[PDB]
Structures are given as C-alpha cells and as structure tokens.
Amino acid sequence: TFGYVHGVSGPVVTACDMAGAAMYELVRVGHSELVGEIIRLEGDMATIQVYEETSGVSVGDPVLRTGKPLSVELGPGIMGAIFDGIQRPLSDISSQTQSIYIPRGVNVSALSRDIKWEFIPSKNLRVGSHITGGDIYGIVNENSLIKHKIMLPPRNRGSVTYIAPPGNYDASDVVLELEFEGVKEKFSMVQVWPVRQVRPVTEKLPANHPLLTGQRVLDALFPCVQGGTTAIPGAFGCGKTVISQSLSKYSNSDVIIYVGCGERGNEMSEVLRDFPELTMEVDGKVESIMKRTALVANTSNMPVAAREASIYTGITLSEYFRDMGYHVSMMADSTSRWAEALREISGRLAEMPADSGYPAYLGARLASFYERAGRVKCLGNPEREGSVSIVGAVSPPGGDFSDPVTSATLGIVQVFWGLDKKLAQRKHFPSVNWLISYSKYMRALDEYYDKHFTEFVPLRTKAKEILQEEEDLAEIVQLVGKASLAETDKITLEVAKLIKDDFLQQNGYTPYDRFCPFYKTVGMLSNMISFYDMARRAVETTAQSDNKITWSIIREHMGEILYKLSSMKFKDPVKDGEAKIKADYAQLLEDMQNAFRSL
C-alpha cells in the first residue's frame, strides 16, 4: 500500500494511511525518492525523519513503504572511496551527474556493478561439507595492500552444492550455492546487514597489546590499548582534528575508518589531498595509504537527520572488518554533533526535554554505541583475532566540562585526554593537560614493557612525580617570589620546565617530528631522568660541605650541555639511522657523566 503526506515541518513529516508500517522501516517520500526512517506511530498516522533537505513537498504526496530496515551493503570496492551519511559513493555520483551539486534525490548503487574481481576459493571447500556461518570460502585481492576476504553471513548454515571455480567474477554472479533442507539459495560477494543490530561474536577477550600513537606525550604518559576506547574533549582550536589526522596516518592498525560528522569540508579536502601522496612500507612494498583507509563524510551544511545514520554506518563497517581478522581503529569526530541532531529531532516531536534540552536517552545511545568496542575472537572454524578501537572527540560548548554530553561520555570510556585552551594558546601545540588526564589501562600492560622496555617502567613514574611536584610548588612560587626555597626545589622546578618545553612539546608539521618512534621517546626520558638524579644526588652530597653547589654554579658548569640536551629532539626517524641516534644519546650520557665527575 501507499501513504500520503499529511503534514510537513522541518525535517519531520507525518504520513497518514500507513496502517501496515512498523518502527525503523525505510520509506520514500516525495515525488523524488527521499529516504527516511519511522520514529513514531499513532493509529493510522506515522512520523518520518528524512535525510534530505525538505523543501517543495506538497501534502498528499505519495509515500512508499518497504519492509527492509536501514542497512548497508558490504563487500569489496569500499576502500579508497568516500560515502555520505547513508551509504552513497560521492565519487560515483559526481561522475554520474557531471556537476558540482549533489542532486536532491540522487539514487545510485552503493558499490559498482561493473568492476571485475579476481577470486580464489578455499582449499578445503568440498561438496557436501558444512561451514555453518563465519567461515571464509574465498579470497579476493581487492588491492595490493589489503586482501578482501569473503565469509558466509551469520545466521546461515547448510551443505555445499555448487562452488565457483577460480577466476574473475562480477557482482551478483553466483559464487556459492547452499542446500540445507531441500531449499536452495545463492550468495554473491555482496550482502546486507541492518545497521542497529549487533554482529554476534564467539567471545570478548582482554586487551594485551598497546596501541601506539606516534606522540611522545600520549604514548609515554597516557597510553591507549588496542581494542579499547577513549575520548578527547576540548574547546575549539585545541587541535583535536590534528590528533585525529596523526593517529590515522601513523597507527599500528591495518584499517582505519574516519567518520567526520558535522565539520568543515576543508578537512575532507585535506584528507583527500594528503593521504594519496604519503606511502607506508609493509611486506617489502611501498603503497599509498589510501588503500588501507575508508572515509565516511557528512559536511555540516548537510541535512541534520543524516548524521546519526553516518555514525551508525561507520561502526557497522568497522564491525564488518573486525570479523575479517584485522585490528582496526576509528576516528569518531565530534559526537556532540550527533547529540545536537538528537536534540533537534526531539524538539520537532514535542517530546519532554531533559537536562540541557537533550533527550533523556542520550546516555543510553552513547553507552550502546561505545559498548561495541573490544577485542574479539570471531565466528568460524579458522580462528582469527580481531579488534575495534574507537577514539571519540567531544566538543563541549563553552569549553568547560559541565554539559551532559561530556559527563555522559566520561562514564563509559576508559581513557581520557583532556585539552586545555591556554596550552594551545601558548603554541604548545599538542595541548594535553596531563594534570586532569588519566588512563585505566595501566594494568594488563606491564608485561609488554617488562618483555621489551623494562627500564621504562620506573622512568615514567619518576617523571609523573616530578610533574606533580612542580605543580605542587608552582602556586607558592606564584604567590611569593623566589629566594625563599632550597636548592633541590629550584632544581626540580627548572628541570620540570625543560621537560615541559622539550619533551611535552612536539611539532608534528616539521618534516623531522611528524612521527616519533617509541624507542626515541624511551631514550629521551632515560637521558632526562639520568641527568636529573645525577644533579640532585651531586647537590645533595655537598649539602653540609664548605662549598654548597647551587643552581647558578650548575648553569655555569653545564649551560652548553643543557643546550645539547634541549636540541636532543632533532633526530629524524629517516635519513638518520637508529644506531647512530642511539649512539649519540649514549655519547651525550657519557659527556654528562664526565662533566659531573669533573665537578
């Protein structure tokens, strides 16, 4: 049957004559085919949110119904392209229309129906065997960097009847036919999945491997774990987008899905421009990093309703690739934008408001979304171990942490990277407020450091204590000037200041600091702490002597050595061997030892 457009108001549309409808069913409204979802029923009337700008819609316009809920088409061809809030390849659309603007009711296939794909069936696939879901039954070298696997969709089982031979195949060509109870059914290399349904798993597993970030600050002090979760609040201009870009460029993961919702499209242009040039080395081959990334975008000026759809689509794709046997991370940008969209839709429904005008179920939705993370043993007889990590970014209005959005997110994630506006004002570009930041993955990670970098463990603790002690003095320094403190205090203050100016600071846009390997950070911290304790012990041992070593004497003795220690950060990961920089650090340490003993 077909409904009719009883009334319109903003992005919401009431439709009569919809007796057979149900919640969360896709619908089409207008003479143009505007996609939407149902959100409220009342007798024969219904309510529809629409993902297109609403204008030029009459009453009584026909409305079509379909029993399919919102879904995404999953398969090859995804990477290297870009999609809208709903699954719609922008590049294909732009080639189709030959214009600048997106048509109001453009409708094109999610994936190409003409590209050909090589195929290799499994070496254990015999006629009459059973796989009962989750088993890979073929391989496709979609791109040189990453090879797409195809597995039986879940909730499927039955004996093998037909197997496609090795070779080339286009979409919708019969790959595998399966017979269970006298019913025959065919599958291709593309399938469908509802967006809001959680993909089943065999079991969730604990985190056991660190996920590096390429920043001296984050890896050293507030590390994140593979398969974990986190959030990054902070006012505008604190460089959240920069951190997201750096993580996407230099992670340890295989595949990265960047979901930008409600931002400038110039960021999308930056991603489109920079990533193709940059290359990364695995398997003895150098490949443009676009092959290992997929991009979902929703510019700010687009209609409000699509934004939730974008956030859901992104995690659905991440899920599909976690099932594939890879570690993947996500860059969820500005989930507060999603909150804003919820606020608007609830506003047009005359629903009772909650704190700060947001709907009541904001917390529930955020918890449900962030729960999907975690390491996973997957379904299937050939066991694989995958994982999903979500690195969310929050944008609290006013720059404080009182809005319900941020407080809600704090109660779910395990790692928290606060940013402070004054620090970014300082041009301390990676503005991380170590004081407020914290991480709850300190445990279940000490084994990794004990197995590789055992010395790092005391070192970081010492640095943290030094930072805290600096803070604990700074207020009394500010209230009352100097010349009222012991030598140890001023020494600790000054070394903490140099830590601040050098170690914490990191300019990722110079060619030589775009990325910092972990061992460089370890060596830097080792040199710093060695110098600190050596100086402190030296001055302490002369406390009761006839010649008390003061800080001015230390400066006169070691100004040039301090200068070299400051310039220590000028070590390019390329064009300079690991061995030579390590030897340079060792030689500097020996110099520090000699200068101390000479005194």
């Binding site: 009883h6 009334g7 319109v8 108001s9 903003g10 009431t14 700008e53 609403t54 204008s55 030029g56 819609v57 009459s58 009453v59 009584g60 870009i82 922008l90 659309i93 732009s94 600048i100 603007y101 997106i102 505008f236 201009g237 409600g262 400038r264 499209g265 110039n266 242009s269 930056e270 489109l272 421009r273 975008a297 510019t299 700010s300 000026n301 409000v304 804003e340 606020r343 608007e344 609830s346 506003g347 700060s356 005008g357 944008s395 209005p397 006013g398 720059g399 970014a424 004002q425 300082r426 041009k427 000037g481 100097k482 100016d501 300019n507 110079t510 100004g559 400051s566 310039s567 000028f570």
Partner: protein
Amino acid sequence: YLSQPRLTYKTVSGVNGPLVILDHVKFPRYAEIVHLTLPDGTKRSGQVLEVSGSKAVVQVFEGTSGIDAKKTSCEFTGDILRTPVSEDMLGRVFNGSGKPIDRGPVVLAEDFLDIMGQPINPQCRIYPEEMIQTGISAIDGMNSIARGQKIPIFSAAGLPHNEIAAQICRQAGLVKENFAIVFAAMGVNMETARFFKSDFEENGSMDNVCLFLNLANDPTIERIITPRLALTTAEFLAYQCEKHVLVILTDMSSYAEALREVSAAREEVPGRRGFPGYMYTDLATIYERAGRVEGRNGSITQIPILTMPNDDITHPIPDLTGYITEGQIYVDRQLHNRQIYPPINVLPSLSRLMKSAIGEGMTRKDHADVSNQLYACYAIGKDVQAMKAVVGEEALTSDDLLYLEFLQKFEKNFITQGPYENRTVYETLDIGWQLLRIFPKEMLKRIPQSTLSEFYP
C-alpha cells in the same frame, strides 16, 4: 515552467505574533512564498514555515500590523523563494529584498536562482593554497589570509573595526586582479554605511562593488533573508563567471538576534543563553559557502564581522563562530586604550591555514619558524609582565629585562602601523629578524639550528 493561474485566499483563520494561520489551502507547498494585501493600499510578503492538513502557517518578513482577518487577501505563487540575478547588479545599491535605492530600474535578470543554494560535494572542491597579501603585519607576518578561507573578525562595541575592514578591502593583492566586493549590511548605524560608501568611492573601484543595505530602522525579520541574497549574488559571480569575489558582512550578531526572536515567537527548544537549539546548523549554512571548486578559476572569500556583547568569549555566538570557521582575528580594547591603530591582540588570533600557503616557493622557508618563535617570546613577555606586576622591579633577572625589552619593541614596531601604509611580506620578515636579534642566539629554542646558522647574523 509554470502556466497556471495563482490561487487567492481570504481565509485568515488566526494571527499570533509575527505569524498568520490560514485555512482551506489546496495542496500547499512547504517553503512557499506568498504575497498579501493589507486593508489599505500597501502590500507585504512572507514564507511558509510548516503545513498540516488544510491549515498553513506563514511568517511576514516585515512584521505584522493591522492585518484584518476579513479584508486582506493572499496570493500563492506556488514556488520556493527565488531571486533575480544578473551580472549588471555590479555598481548598484539595494536595500533589503534587493529593491533598488540608487534610483535605477528594476533588476533585469539573466537567471533566476534558488536562495537556499545547495551543499557542495566535498569530492569536487579544491583545497585553497594561494596567499593573499594584505599589507598589515599583524595579519600576514603572524597569520595568513588565503584565497578561499572564511576567517571572521571578532570585535567589541565602540572598537575601531570598520576601518580595519576598509583597509583590508582597500589594498588586497597577491604576493609576487579585480576583487569584486559584495558588502551586505545587517542592522547597522547609518554612519558606518556612509563611511563604507565614502571609502569605496575614494578607492575608485565603484565599478566592482554590489551593495546590500539594511539600517536598524528596517523591519526586524528582513535580516534573516538579507545575507543569503548577497551570498547568492556572490556565488553567481564566482562560479558562473569565474571572478574572484571578496565578501564582507557587517554584523552577524544582529542576524543572531533576528533568529532568536523568530525562534522564541514559535516556542522552540532553547539551549545556551536563550538561543535556538539549531542555530549551529544555520550558521553552518551561511558560513559554508566558500572555497574554490574543481575546474573553475573563481573564488569566494568571507570576512564576516561579528560583535561579542562584551569581552566574554564563551558567549555562544563567538564560540560557534569559532567552531565553524578555521580561525579568527581578535581585536582587544586594551590596545585601543593605548592608541595603537591596529588593536590586534596577536595572541588569541590563531588562523589554521598557515600550513599550505607558507614556506619555500611562496614566501621563504623561515617564515613559519620566526612566527612560532615570536609567539613564544611574546607569551613569555606577557608572563614576565605579570610577574613584575606582583613582585616588583628589583626582584627580576636579566632574562626578564630581555623579555620586557622584546615586548616593548615588538608592540612598538611590528604591530603599530600606519593607516595608509603598505608593508610587503619581506619587510615584515626583516622586522621579525630585527626583533629576534635582541635575544641571544642560545635562547631561540623554537628555531632549528640549520636556520639560525644562516639567518641569525
């Protein structure tokens, strides 16, 4: 192509505030534009906000007054708001709704364009990379204007921002054109309007300026449509004609006031400080018309001007303006009290596009490093001044004296500037190096060794 007669109504079923509810409309259209006739001889216009059943709701762009539920009539054109536009609008001055006030004829249109525009597909937009010289050292030296960006101008009441706009639009150029100006004024004093007009007439480029005006006496609701129209004209000239158009808006805060008033009339969800909950989306819609496009050589740059109610920054208007735009140029009353003709507090004035328009090929390799170093040194100058304020002169050290000296000389030379001068970029860099030379070689920790080994002496 429409060929049917219009429909005419007298069924005015109600009125409430700036809204009018009609009844028994036959297939009403969302966002339809409607004319109407007051009982006297005047005529008004409006737009449909929502529809339900046979009922309809409209909003009068120029305030409701004296409308009679029995006598007035209405006229349903059946189309969304669409404007005339032609290349010849250049040289002409309009009020709100585009009506001529320069005593010329009606607008003879080449084309009719939808006001609301369309989003630009991110796939087919080119990232800006070109550097627009500006002649003010506080902007070029330590920030960057690029062809295509949309940086706003934070300002406060009474502070001298209008001549900053005049100066930036007077001597715009490219480091080594036309710059058709479109200048929309939303609820501003007559004095500033005449000031801008006189300045453009003095500049002698009156052949390249299309104006839109709205004094504070004009109807309140008109302001919501005032800027979109000018932006549509600019877009026409930018994309269908591949011209380089610069755009300037006077007061976004007035537009925000009009919007809060409209939303409050309808009793919609409030957020921070009595604003509409969705003001973010509309600000995005207005601000996002910018950046060049694949295959065409035109360009759209925006320098909107908005006024914080007071020195507070967390007020929602400037906050969301910061969220959308990729930076901002701050103006501080403190410098104005000290009579520095550009009162630009360089510190809070971050711009985001200094990446791709600076370095070898464009200006020099050392530009970014000197700007960063100057940031650090100026900041330490502020901090030591704060320390001075509490401890006293005699408790300081030599380093403090050096930093205070740097602060004084920097504000004396780099920022302080003539109203009509025109500084080249290289002169600004030379000034920066002169300032840097005050510090010893060793204190410059934001510069690589390779650069100071060549440029420090």
